Ligand binder design. Structure first.
Ligand SMILES: [Mg+2]
Ligand SMILES: [Mg+2]
Ligand SMILES: [Mg+2]
Ligand SMILES: [Mg+2]
Lengths: 268, 275, 271, 268
């Protein structure tokens, strides 16, 4: 079996492929039961959820690898991972990172040019080191760029093909506000484009149909479920503390039968 | 500063002391913000939450340690930990488990007498191996008994005495259904009594006022937040999968500002501004 | 496929010398010395990585850490001592087998240790490991001590049963005569591993002698480790006694040798 | 507390010999040999535990694992090589410092390497490390290679700034004269550590010599490790060339010596 294959196959059977972030192994199983073909391990989520830390580069590759093992050990859905800038700097750092992640169970990962961003060149080597470190060719190397917002469209598209020439299997344009931009990246890069549809950002809540008219090959929802899980956990804590009992929040609680079924308790 | 001292100080300041489970570091910080004085690491939660596996002894000590460090590295609230039966059928194991758990940052832990449960003489030896291994005396060793699920109250009360004698700092009487049962353990054990007020169990949803009348020292809610977290998560998944958009789910989502405040984001930025 | 590389080493070298590597650095020294397969001793993980006696105190986690460190830098197929599966439940053996393979190992062995469990008990453990296996090339070796315990009659029977159960190779403990390995090889009908550790009961059989015995693998679990400790103790002692390490400089690997062994310049080249 | 134990060891021995222990087993050997403090070499974690060069490839997690393994079984206070803090920001330094203490370390040293950062940058790393520390007895050592990179003046200027910033002790590199060590001790006014590693440009100073130079600590980072690698290689080569280890039996630690060092019989 090859998670890299499963991922590439998912984008093939679903367009745009809906990829939802799963904060932990339990939610990965839920996402599966909901019919999702692929999941995501958000870097911001590992920091905020697993570590209770802001997304300021305090988490480490190890924190990330732990969640990949937990998730991919029980959930077979191909897992797309946020590998940031490689957590290292040199070629062997990017390589060790890419191999670690793949070995942990990932199906794909994405590295970004955000140092402002790095030069086209340096990002080109970063991608080469990533592609070179890859053992399974089906493993997906995604290149995330923020050049559009930094250097402008022209420079953005230039990097696009540059990154693709280096071997990036897919592109991840960040902070896009207009579908047009997606079609352009698709027309130039000519590789599966990913639309990050996260909430409370500068991007509109595009629907799968809208994203399709723009040629988007993947629709990402990084923290969607996490944001809802926090609001509900907070409600439980709040009510329990005020009322001295959780009686009035039982109705918003997943039942046992539900928990057991989501984790195949009975089966064991 | 000791976490064990913090746990004990929490008890003296809140009676009964509400101890809520936090499935991860983020929720621990939420619990702290909600005003709680102590938190809990559920073994069933590590299994089902962190591993997505059933609570059937599949999780290892390492899975637990990882969650203990993550939680206690960012949240100062004393953490009570479910050490199951000691992770290891050997006395050596129990000792290494106790020391490792404390080192990971826990303030307390509870070890149980399950094998059906083991005999008194048996449980008494596990308790002794744990108290022996403990380096910091303030670190709490709570003794949990599941006798009430297959035995009568009297039988359960008997063990309670033997457990305390071995060195058990506190008692965790499982499956109690009558307020008076708590009172009897409190009067026989002579040490703080914890009441597991988890949902969908044989134990009624007793209120803090009810438990207080029964002389209960701690009120435990092991997976409460976790259960509501799962439902809401699923809701988002289902809708997003049916309507190809999360638009109709925005209203039940924690806002960016709320997320940032819970993890002290602005505070980190402040320190940078300072430089 | 690490399992595929392990089987190819078996076919290429007969008997195949499998030396223990206490850590990633020694795995590279072994590789540079020409070895085709290495070993991760469970007794090594306890005494070396944890400083604890080999009495069941280490956990699967301690072992997975060493497997990753070793396989993340050394490509040689690694045979791992998995004891009895770490746990007691078929779920534990399966989770252990998968974990070990995922960590990067090429093979592992499990024993009928509880006195030894019953044949049926072991057979189930083996079946559990074989079914948990994802890569059919990943090797599952069955270690047994039936000979000493229950005698040859029962031992030879367990052997066949283990093989019928799915064991790719056999690791029969307590053998002191080549004629006995020969017998075990004929019965089992799968590669036999001979444990040539020192300070034990088994003679220090040579690769030639083992070959004449139909032995497929020669294992040296702690050999390098034993020597590294005596040398280390020597440095600690002299330095403490004399207030300088001047007189032990001659038994030390130089910095150039260390750099060379880990390919220092090829990395700095990338940088 | 380990920090208390480290300072107690320093108070009772002059200079305090601190030998590196590559793993838990060697920590125990150092202990049986009479040492009162041991060290976890950063280059040792890389070359020994990871089989990689000391070029910034190891992560904080690799170091932490070794600290726990060693300190869980050996009570001798452990001085840890925290490199530059395993991160670029003060947040990384704080997380690194707390994690290392939590793992069981008694003290750590952080350096000004990047070329070296400006005096001001190092002053900030130290301040973050000092602020992150929860137990004042836990030692924060400042390591500097400014002597070789910038010269005497810059080195002494940095030293004083480092002490003013909160560094409990100083680890000045590249000193080749006992007389210069005295100068650093006099200007810095905090315990000075002298690195007596082999095959470098520095002399193999005896403890009596270091004492005359007012040196408070003598460090032997990989001494045992070096000898262990030569012996191990010897076994590997002879066994490969002769087809048996009969001829290297005489350089092997016996089963009883091993059992004795790990207290086998006691557990039994
Ligand atoms: Mg990210
Ligand atoms: Mg439990
Ligand atoms: Mg073994
Ligand atoms: Mg270093």
């Amino acid at each position: 079996h090859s998670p890299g294959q499963a991922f590439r196959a998912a984008l093939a059977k679903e367009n745009p492929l809906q990829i939802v972030g799963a904060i932990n192994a339990n939610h990965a199983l839920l996402a599966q039961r909901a019919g999702y073909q692929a999941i995501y391990l958000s870097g911001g989520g590992v920091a905020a959820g697993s570590l209770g830390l802001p997304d300021l580069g305090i988490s480490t590759l190890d924190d990330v690898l732990t969640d990949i093992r937990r998730i991919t050990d029980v959930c077979p859905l191909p897992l797309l991972v946020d590998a940031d800038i490689g957590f290292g700097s040199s070629a062997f750092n990017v390589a060790r990172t890419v191999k670690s992640i793949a070995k942990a169970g990932a199906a794909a990962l994405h590295i970004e040019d955000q140092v402002a961003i790095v030069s086209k060149e340096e990002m080109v080597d970063r991608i080469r080191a990533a592609v070179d470190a890859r053992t399974d060719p089906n493993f997906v190397i995604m290149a995330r760029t923020d050049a559009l917002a930094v250097e402008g469209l022209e420079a953005a598209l230039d990097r696009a093909q540059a990154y693709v020439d280096a071997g990036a299997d897919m592109l991840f344009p960040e902070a896009i506000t207009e579908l047009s931009m997606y079609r352009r990246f698709a027309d130039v890069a000519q590789v599966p484009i990913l639309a990050n549809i996260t909430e409370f950002g500068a991007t509109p809540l595009f629907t799968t149909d809208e994203l399709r008219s723009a040629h988007v090959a993947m629709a990402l929802y990084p923290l969607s479920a996490f944001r809802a899980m926090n609001r509900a956990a907070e409600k439980v804590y709040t009510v329990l503390r005020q009322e001295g009992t959780q009686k009035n929040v039982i109705d918003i609680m997943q039942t046992r039968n539900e928990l057991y079924e989501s984790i195949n308790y009975y089966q064991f």
